[PDB]
Amino acid sequence: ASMDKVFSGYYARQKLLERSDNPFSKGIAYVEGKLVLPSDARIPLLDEGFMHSDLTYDVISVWDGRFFRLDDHLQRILESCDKMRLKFPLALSSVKNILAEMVAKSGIRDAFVEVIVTRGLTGVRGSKPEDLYNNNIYLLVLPYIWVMAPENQLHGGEAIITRTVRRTPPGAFDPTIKNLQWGDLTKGLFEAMDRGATYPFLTDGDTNLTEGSGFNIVLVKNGIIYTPDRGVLRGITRKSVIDVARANSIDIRLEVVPVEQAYHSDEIFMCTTAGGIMPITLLDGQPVNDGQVGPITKKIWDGYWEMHYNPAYSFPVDYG
Ligand X SMILES: Cc1ncc(COP(=O)(O)O)c(CNc2cccc(C(=O)O)c2)c1O
Would you tell me the crossing angle of helices 70-84 and 92-106 to the nearest 10 degrees?
130
Specify the stretch interacting with a copy of itself by CB under 8 A; choose among 12-20, 33-41, 98-106, 293-301: 33-41
Q: Is 132 in the site for Na ion (CB under 5 A)?
A: yes
Q: Is 190 in the site for a copy of itself (CB under 8 A)?
A: yes
Specify the stretch interacting with a copy of itself by CB under 8 A; choose among 36-44, 216-224, 260-268, 282-290: 36-44
198: left (phi > 0), else alpha (psi -120 to 50), else beta? alpha
Contact 113, 60 (CB under 8 A): yes
* Nearer Cβ to a copy of itself (5/52): 52
Q: Minimum Å distance from CB 17 to a copy of itself?
A: 17
* Nearer Cβ to Na ion (136/216): 136
Task: Output the CA–CA distances (angstroms, integers) from residue 320 to 78, 103, 105, 239, in the order listed.
Answer: 30, 11, 9, 32
Parallel/antiparallel/unpaired status of strands 252-255 and 224-228:
parallel
Q: Is 235 in the site for ligand X (CB under 6 A)?
A: yes
Count how many Cα atoms sit within 13 Å of the Cα of residue 143 in the half-sphere of its side chain: 13
Give the integer Cα–Cα distance in Å for 143 and 174.
30
Size of interface with a copy of itself, in residues (CB under 8 A): 48
Residues 136-175 that bind ligand X (CB under 6 A): 145
Element (H, E) at 40: none
Contact 118, 54 (CB under 8 A): yes
Contact 16, 319 (CB under 8 A): no
Q: Is 150 in the site for a copy of itself (CB under 8 A)?
A: no
Residue 273 counted as an annotated binding residue: yes
Parallel/antiparallel/unpaired status of strands 276-283 and 157-161:
parallel
Specify the stretch interacting with ligand X by CB under 6 A; choose among 23-31, 196-204, 213-221, 281-289: 213-221
Residues 242-301 that bind ligand X (CB under 6 A): 271-274
* Nearer Cβ to ligand X (217/250): 217
Site string for a copy of itself, 233-262 (x = CB under 8 A): ------------------------------
Residues within the interface to ligand X (CB under 6 A): 59, 125, 145, 211, 214-216, 233, 235-238, 271-274
Point out the annotated binding site for pyridoxal 5'-phosphate.
76, 236-237, 273
